[PDB]
């Protein structure tokens, strides 16, 4: 991870081509004011259903792709949209793609699953000690959007190659809590017998 | 005759006159280091 003191996040990954093009090595731009939201006060996640209250497209419903916490943005899939070409060569302009335009978190409310309405989500700690999101308006428990992971490896469908360790072996507890260190342990195990000892040494 | 070539590079003379050890041997050398740290120089001593 490479970051400068003044940096603008352009939907582009910090370590990427589009980003090195966006803000080259020598740029310093105006400050971007970010209304502070502490991590614990943050009520949004990627994958949950939200309602957009703002803009040309409002009152609609949508799923969240990813949240960028630095500049405080949420991403609704194919909802707020502007048009960007992909391939452009001299004689040809190919692949016109509808692209998601970023949305501020003031324009987006979290939708409670049952009656499908926008609400203010507030953190509650239950009697059992779980952290749940309770609707102020509707008075419900709001789930958080169990979602895939970045690598696209689903644990349920998986196969070991030659170099993958089978679960049974990796879990097996072989540890024998005795007072030796790795040196004396291995040396005793390998059957390497040492007799002569170190002469006295001074430390300055 | 023609001048301005006065500096004839030598690595031994350079370290012997301006090098870290030479500084540290004498009190005033030490203060050269000290002042140079107070100004926060990238290079303290030759």
């Amino acid at each position: 991870v490479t970051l400068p003191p003044n940096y603008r996040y352009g939907m582009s990954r910090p370590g990427s081509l589009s980003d090195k093009r966006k803000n080259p090595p020598g740029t310093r731009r105006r400050r971007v004011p970010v209304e502070p939201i502490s991590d614990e006060d943050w009520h949004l996640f990627c994958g949950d259903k939200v309602e957009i209250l703002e803009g040309k497209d409002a009152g609609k419903q949508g799923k969240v792709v990813q949240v960028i916490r630095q500049r405080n943005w949420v991403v609704v899939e194919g909802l707020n949209t502007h048009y960007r070409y992909v391939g452009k060569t001299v004689d040809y302009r190919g692949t016109m793609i509808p692209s998601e335009a970023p949305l501020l978190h003031n324009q987006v409310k979290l939708v409670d699953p049952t009656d499908r309405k926008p609400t203010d989500v507030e953190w509650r700690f239950t009697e059992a000690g779980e952290r749940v999101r309770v609707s102020t308006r509707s008075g419900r428990i709001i789930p958080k959007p169990e979602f895939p992971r970045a690598d696209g490896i689903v644990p349920e469908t998986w196969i070991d190659g030659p170099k993958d360790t089978s679960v049974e072996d990796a879990l097996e507890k072989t540890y024998v809590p005795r007072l030796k260190t790795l040196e004396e342990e291995v040396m005793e195990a390998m059957g390497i017998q040492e007799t002569r000892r170190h002469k006295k040494v001074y430390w300055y | 005759k023609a001048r301005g070539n006065e500096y004839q590079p030598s690595n031994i003379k350079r370290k012997h006159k301006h090098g870290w050890v030479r500084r540290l041997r004498t009190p005033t050398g030490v203060q050269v280091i000290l002042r140079r740290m107070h100004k926060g120089r990238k290079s303290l001593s030759h």
Binding site: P33, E35, P36, D151, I153, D160, G161, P162, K163, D164, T165, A170, L171, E172, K173, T174, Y175, V176, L179, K180, T181, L182, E185, V186, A189, V201, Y202, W203, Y204 | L24, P27, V30, Q31, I33, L34, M37, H38
Partner: protein, 178 residues
């Protein structure tokens, strides 16, 4: 010597899958010999990855599944953590000296306070030449300089505060909260 290379059938393929890197908890359960062995299974894989790295750089071709190199690092890094604990715990339980290498607190020439790591010499300290002309103490004039950085530091701290102050105000006048 083939061990510097991937299984021959695996060369031209774009993506190659591998597992998760070892998490400490999985390593705590292994005995000493097992960690000691795992170390080399990790080592060889690391060399093979490294070689593929360089080679891919030379052939002007992007390198297949870079994730691997990240993973084999972590596990090794993990493995270390596990053994370091088992030493550092045990040495407490035996001696009660927290730090593994001998060491002292010194006032060096420049009046800083420093952690002096000891060294191992064949002869006593009063008989060692180099160790004798190393001075640990300060002189009178250093007292002045000692002051200056205390003063200099005090400014960088004092005017960092005054930045965090301003930041709070702008935001509050820019965002009429509540």
């Amino acid at each position: 010597l083939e061990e510097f290379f991937d299984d021959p059938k695996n060369w031209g393929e774009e993506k190659v899958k591998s597992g998760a890197s070892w998490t400490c908890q999985q390593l705590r359960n292994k005995s000493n010999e097992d960690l000691h062995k795992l170390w080399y299974v990790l080592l060889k894989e690391r060399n093979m990855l490294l070689t593929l790295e360089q080679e891919a750089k030379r052939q002007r071709l992007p390198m297949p599944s870079p994730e691997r190199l990240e993973k084999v690092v972590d596990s090794m890094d993990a493995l270390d953590k596990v053994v370091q604990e088992r030493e550092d715990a045990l040495r407490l339980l035996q001696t009660g000296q927290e730090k593994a290498r001998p060491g002292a607190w010194r006032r060096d020439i420049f009046g800083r306070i420093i952690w002096h790591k000891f060294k191992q010499w064949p002869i006593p300290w009063y008989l060692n030449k180099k160790y004798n002309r190393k001075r640990f103490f300060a002189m009178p004039y250093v007292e002045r300089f000692v002051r200056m950085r205390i003063e200099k530091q005090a400014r960088i701290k004092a005017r960092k505060r005054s930045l965090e102050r301003k930041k709070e105000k702008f935001l509050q006048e820019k965002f009429p909260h509540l």
